[PDB]
UniProtKB/TrEMBL annotation:
Protein name, as recorded: Hypothetical conserved protein
InterPro entries listed in its UniProt record: CO_DH_gsu, START-like_dom_sf
Keyword flag Secreted: no
Gene3D superfamilies: 3.30.530.20
CDD domains (alphabetical): CoxG
Keyword annotations: Plasmid
Species, as recorded: Geobacillus kaustophilus (strain HTA426)
Domain of life per record: Bacteria
């Protein structure tokens, strides 16, 4: 599973970077996320209860933020595992100012998915990942507000 995409967001690069680096805000914007516990340097443990039928399940995920270059670039390493199977993933995120008021976020990711859940299909795969990414960027846009091309 490989994808990339981008989102235009309402806020400056700095406005976006401070949401993306705030673990209380992330916990709230990751779907199914009950808690994000710091367990290391730029390393969290997420307790995920995911209700989406096609992938429904409880998963534990290790999420490491690396290559951190504020306020415009980072990498993510994700190791998630549960009853329905497992996910090893890396992604890269870049923030680009498109003007004074507006930021373009792009990303690239790469995921090995295993277990019974792997069988559902690449395309469907696919759609769940786009759904998780869109829903995350949706809630981030909301928390920013207070203060989407996806290719598979």
């Amino acid at each position: 599973l490989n994808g990339n995409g981008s989102i235009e967001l309402k806020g400056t690069v700095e406005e976006v970077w401070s949401k993306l680096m705030d673990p209380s805000i992330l916990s709230k914007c990751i779907m199914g996320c009950k808690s994000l516990e710091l367990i290391g340097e730029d390393k969290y443990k997420a307790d995920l209860q995911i209700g989406i039928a096609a992938v429904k399940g409880k998963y534990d995920a290790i999420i490491e933020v690396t290559d951190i270059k504020p306020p415009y670039h980072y990498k993510l390493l994700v190791n998630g595992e549960g009853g329905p199977g497992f996910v090893n993933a890396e992604g890269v995120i870049d923030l680009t100012p498109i003007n004074d008021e507006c930021t373009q976020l792009t990303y690239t990711y790469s995921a090995e998915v295993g277990g019974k859940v792997a069988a559902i299909g690449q395309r469907m795969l696919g759609g769940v990942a786009k759904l998780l990414i869109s829903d995350f960027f949706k809630k981030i846009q909301k928390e920013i507000a207070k203060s989407h091309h996806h290719h598979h």
